[PDB]
Amino acid sequence: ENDPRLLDILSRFNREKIPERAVHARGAGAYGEFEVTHDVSDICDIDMLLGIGKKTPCAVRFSTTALERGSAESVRDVKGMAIKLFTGDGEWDWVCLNIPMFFIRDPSKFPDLVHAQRPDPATNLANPAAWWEFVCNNHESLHMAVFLFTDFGTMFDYRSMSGYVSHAYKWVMPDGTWKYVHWFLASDQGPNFEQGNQTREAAPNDSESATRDLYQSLERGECPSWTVKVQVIDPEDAPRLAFNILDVSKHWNLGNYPPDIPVIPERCVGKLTLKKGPENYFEEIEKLAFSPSHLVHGVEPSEDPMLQARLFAYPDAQEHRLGPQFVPLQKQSREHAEWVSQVTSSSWSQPNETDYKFPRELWAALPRLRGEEFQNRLVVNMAESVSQIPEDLRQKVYKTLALVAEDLASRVESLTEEMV
Amino acid sequence: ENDPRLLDILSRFNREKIPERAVHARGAGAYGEFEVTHDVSDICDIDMLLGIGKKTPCAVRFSTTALERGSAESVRDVKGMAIKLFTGDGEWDWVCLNIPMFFIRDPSKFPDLVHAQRPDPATNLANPAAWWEFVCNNHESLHMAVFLFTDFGTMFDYRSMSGYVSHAYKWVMPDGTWKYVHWFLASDQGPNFEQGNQTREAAPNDSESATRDLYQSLERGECPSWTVKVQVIDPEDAPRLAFNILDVSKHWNLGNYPPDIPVIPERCVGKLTLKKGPENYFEEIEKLAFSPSHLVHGVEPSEDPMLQARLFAYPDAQEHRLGPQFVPLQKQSREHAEWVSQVTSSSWSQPNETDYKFPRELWAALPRLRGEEFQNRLVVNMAESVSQIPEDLRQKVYKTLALVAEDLASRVESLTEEMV
Numbered sequence: 001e002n003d004p005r006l007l008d009i010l011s012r013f014n015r016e017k018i019p020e021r022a023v024h025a026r027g028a029g030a031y032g033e034f035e036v037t038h039d040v041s042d043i044c045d046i047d048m049l050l051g052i053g054k055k056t057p058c059a060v061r062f063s064t065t066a067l068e069r070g071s072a073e074s075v076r077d078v079k080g081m082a083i084k085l086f087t088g089d090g091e092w093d094w095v096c097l098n099i100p101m102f103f104i105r106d107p108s109k110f111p112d113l114v115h116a117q118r119p120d121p122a123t124n125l126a127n128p129a130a131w132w133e134f135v136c137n138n139h140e141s142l143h144m145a146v147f148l149f150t151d152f153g154t155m156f157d158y159r160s161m162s163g164y165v166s167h168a169y170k171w172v173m174p175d176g177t178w179k180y181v182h183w184f185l186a187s188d189q190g191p192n193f194e195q196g197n198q199t200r201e202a203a204p205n206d207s208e209s210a211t212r213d214l215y216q217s218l219e220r221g222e223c224p225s226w227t228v229k230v231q232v233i234d235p236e237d238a239p240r241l242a243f244n245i246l247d248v249s250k251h252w253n254l255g256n257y258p259p260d261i262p263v264i265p266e267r268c269v270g271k272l273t274l275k276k277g278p279e280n281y282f283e284e285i286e287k288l289a290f291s292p293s294h295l296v297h298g299v300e301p302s303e304d305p306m307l308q309a310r311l312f313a314y315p316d317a318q319e320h321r322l323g324p325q326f327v328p329l330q331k332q333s334r335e336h337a338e339w340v341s342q343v344t345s346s347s348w349s350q351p352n353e354t355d356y357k358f359p360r361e362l363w364a365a366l367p368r369l370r371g372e373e374f375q376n377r378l379v380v381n382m383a384e385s386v387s388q389i390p391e392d393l394r395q396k397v398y399k400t401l402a403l404v405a406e407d408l409a410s411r412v413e414s415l416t417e418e419m420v
Numbered sequence: 421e422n423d424p425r426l427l428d429i430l431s432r433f434n435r436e437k438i439p440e441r442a443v444h445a446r447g448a449g450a451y452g453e454f455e456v457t458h459d460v461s462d463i464c465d466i467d468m469l470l471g472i473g474k475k476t477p478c479a480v481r482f483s484t485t486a487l488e489r490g491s492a493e494s495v496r497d498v499k500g501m502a503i504k505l506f507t508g509d510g511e512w513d514w515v516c517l518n519i520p521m522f523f524i525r526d527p528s529k530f531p532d533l534v535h536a537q538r539p540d541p542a543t544n545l546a547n548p549a550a551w552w553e554f555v556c557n558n559h560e561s562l563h564m565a566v567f568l569f570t571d572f573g574t575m576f577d578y579r580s581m582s583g584y585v586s587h588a589y590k591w592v593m594p595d596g597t598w599k600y601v602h603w604f605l606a607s608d609q610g611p612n613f614e615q616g617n618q619t620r621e622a623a624p625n626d627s628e629s630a631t632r633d634l635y636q637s638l639e640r641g642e643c644p645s646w647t648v649k650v651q652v653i654d655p656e657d658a659p660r661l662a663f664n665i666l667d668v669s670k671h672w673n674l675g676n677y678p679p680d681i682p683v684i685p686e687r688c689v690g691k692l693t694l695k696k697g698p699e700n701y702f703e704e705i706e707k708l709a710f711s712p713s714h715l716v717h718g719v720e721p722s723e724d725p726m727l728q729a730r731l732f733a734y735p736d737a738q739e740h741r742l743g744p745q746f747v748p749l750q751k752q753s754r755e756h757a758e759w760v761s762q763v764t765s766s767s768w769s770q771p772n773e774t775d776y777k778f779p780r781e782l783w784a785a786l787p788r789l790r791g792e793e794f795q796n797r798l799v800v801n802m803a804e805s806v807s808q809i810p811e812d813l814r815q816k817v818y819k820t821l822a823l824v825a826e827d828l829a830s831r832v833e834s835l836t837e838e839m840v
């Protein structure tokens with residue numbers, strides 16, 4: 001010690017690591033561009049989206065959700081896709097999940113949900129009991145639960161996944177009229193709901209299989225691409241829908257389920273192609289800052305309470321993580337006002353019939369569009385998870401599943417009791 | 421948003437994570453006690469070591485070395501064991517590795533070595549090329565290299581590993597006389613150099629196999645134990661030894677290799693038994709602070725330059741990681757003075773004959789004490805690692821290995837060329 005040169009070298013080495021992200025800590029990154037392929041000048045006034053053939057540079061970060069920096073990328077989890085676009089009007093961020101539904105509806109429950117998916121606070125091991133307790137206490141997560149224990153829970157790498165903003169936004173015209181919008185990116189080298197499964201199994205002991213897949217595909221000359229599509233709803237038609245489009249835990253039906261809810265059609269916008277990887281991972285990918293509050297002229301947030309909370313949360317989290325510490329809108333009708341005020345009532349945090357209707361119809365649709373083996377594998381995965389928790393929690397889970405569907409609960413209980 | 425309660429909840433959640441340790445980021449912890457079993461009053465004046473049957477509470481943290489928080493614990497790596505003992509004279513820290521040798525003896529090279537074992541700075545993937553360049557540029561790591569690619573590289577969990585302080589310390593008597601000492605903990609449920617291999621193969625996709633093993637063993641009622649032993653050298657006998665005991669990259673021979681270096685015998689001191697696990701992992705294990713500078717009356721550091729650098733580095737690193745940011749000694753002879761001044765010369769950072777003698781004798785001892793299959797597996801592991809690097813670096817590695825033994829280099833070269 002003692003030597004000033006050695007002290008400087010060691011002190012510089014000591015201050016090299018920073019806190020990881022609270023969620024989505026493990027991930028990879030790439031650079032590409034977006035190109036406009038269709039005309040949307042009748043619903044949009046965003047400069048980035050006007051003019052067929054226009055190109056915009058973009059940077060993308062893929063991630064998992066629940067575990068730490070060095071965790072395996074082939075786990076049962078939801079995946080994230082964050083896109084930063086450098087337009088002439090500034091930076092536009094699309095922070096998407098690989099599925100258009102979310103776990104919860106009330107933002108004040110967000111930390112608890114996160115704690116339900118982190119390792120055990122005493123042993124630092126995996127703990128399904130907290131997750132199943134949260135599910136039994138918050139029925140609006142049931143829909144997502146049914147999704148997570150199918151094959152779709154473990155099906156996607158960074159190239160075969162899709163991305164959905166999952167919120168309703170507002171697109172505004174210069175005359176003041178606006179529409180509710182939801183856009184998403186469909187993978188050009190991945191499956192969909194109707195057809196397609198995993199085609200490249202990860203190595204038995206590989207924790208970075210998806211990162212390796214993306215890096216090797218980029219080095220081989222292949223360029224992954226996504227097709228961007230949007231769904232449009234008139235503000236006066238929203239209060240009359242069979243579901244609430246301000247509820248982030250529900251999706252907008254594209255033609256799969258539930259059958260009694262009419263389809264909201266989508267239209268194409270453009271295409272996103274990834275070209276190259278980074279030169280310095282820590283400086284370019286690890287320190288990337290994304291926020292849903294990064295918006296350009298012509299796009300506004302809606303009255304979604306989760307989106308409103310996200311507008312504040314991301315800059316504050318980045319202040320902790322990267323800090324020095326180391327056109328007027330036209331008015332709608334009174335009925336629209338009541339429908340909007342629905343989201344600030346005390347019943348917003350209580351379950352309704354739709355919270356059970358959506359998972360029931362997904363469970364019914366699984367054998368019609370995929371087959372009996374898909375449903376059987378869902379039952380097997382759920383039983384494998386449930387057979388690790390104490391008996392009273394098991395009975396509570398059985399009751400909740402019966403609230404979803406009787407045959408699903410009976411099958412899960414019968415298969416789970418044989419595994420304990 | 422806009423609710424002060426929600427803002428407080430989200431802001432509190434946003435600040436929970438802190439930066440991980442620069443090294444040894446992944447690990448687990450436990451609590452136990454140390455008990456004295458033998459009399460060492462003739463060489464020691466430390467309060468906690470005097471009196472047969474005396475008990476001292478202690479807290480232990482086990483860890484890996486190179487990878488991040490959520491990485492697998494069954495990787496080819498060296499393991500760490502940190503023991504904090506709560507004595508009547510203060511806190512005494514034993515910060516040990518699972519092997520008594522280290523990679524280097526010049527502290528100014530420490531960060532580079534660490535960077536040679538971290539993931540690729542551009543792709544965040546495993547990069548064998550950086551490791552072999554360091555070995556070809558720093559021959560004093562060759563010894564450790566030979567250790568790392570044997571079975572001992574992947575043999576130990578947290579219960580079957582041993583611990584070595586690896587440095588020379590000074591134990592001082594009240595009259596001013598002192599001795600060079602090195603103490604270590606031998607596992608009571610693990611293998612040794614001559615006998616024993618792995619008996620608990622980890623699961624194919626388990627990243628927390630060692631933590632689970634320790635937690636389950638503690639829950640079953642089994643208490644792991646270690647036997648503490650010490651080796652003693654008189655200061656006037658150190659300058660005449662065939663090796664430098666102030667070189668942390670060498671070990672003190674206990675009877676295995678090299679045959680021409682006489683044995684330095686050990687004597688028993690006491691026993692360490694682990695009893696219980698933590699209640700809050702983050703508050704008790706993750707925020708634990710260890711330092712070799714935590715010393716009690718009667719024990720002093722030696723003139724080891726690596727130890728002198730570690731005396732400063734640990735409090736500074738803890739200041740970054742956990743900070744608000746989120747008896748006179750007897751004089752020796754002139755010959756001892758020259759021998760000590762040897763460690764401050766310019767030739768300290770250059771290889772000597774011992775740097776080649778130690779790994780050569782380990783390679784020769786492997787078949788005599790473990791069989792031919794051990795040596796063959798070492799060759800196979802080395803070839804598997806070397807076959808992923810460019811050809812010029814491969815030739816450099818072959819030339820570097822030729823300086824240890826010709827047969828080892830030829831066998832590795834043949835296997836590696838067949839593998840590519």
Ligand code: HEM
Nearest residue numbers: 021024061080081082095096097107110165166290313317
């Ligand atoms: C109340 C709801 C939510 C809150 C409070 C929340 C909070 C956060 C926070 C604190 C981060 C870390 C940001 C950073 O440290 O820089 C993050 C990252 C992220 N979130 Fe959310 N989140 C919520 C829901 C969602 C939703 C609904 C989506 C997608 C539709 C989403 C997708 C993502 C993604 C992809 C990232 C990773 C961004 C990156 O890679 O840099 N989260 N979120």
Ligand code: HEM
Nearest residue numbers: 441444481500501502515516517527530585586710733737
């Ligand atoms: C020049 C040489 C070395 C330097 C500069 C160095 C530096 C460090 C640093 C910065 C930490 C992180 C401490 C913290 O963030 O709280 C650490 C941890 C650790 N080091 Fe060293 N190290 C060196 C060599 C060694 C040696 C020779 C050993 C063992 C004989 C060792 C064993 C450990 C262990 C076990 C830990 C983990 C402590 C814990 O779990 O809290 N290191 N070292």
Ligand SMILES: C=C(C)/C=C/c1cccc2[nH]cc(C[C@H](NC)C(=O)O)c12
Nearest residue numbers: 100147152162191192193251254255256
């Ligand atoms: C895209 C895949 C592979 C799975 C989607 C998926 C799976 C399970 C439930 C789902 N609910 C909604 C979706 C996405 C929806 N499927 C018409 C879409 O492509 O807009 C979905």
Ligand SMILES: C=C(C)/C=C/c1cccc2[nH]cc(C[C@H](NC)C(=O)O)c12
Nearest residue numbers: 520567572582611612613671674675676
């Ligand atoms: C203790 C195990 C299982 C292996 C030790 C080991 C292995 C390879 C090279 C080694 N060099 C020195 C040791 C440790 C040394 N073996 C007499 C001891 O027990 O003090 C060692």
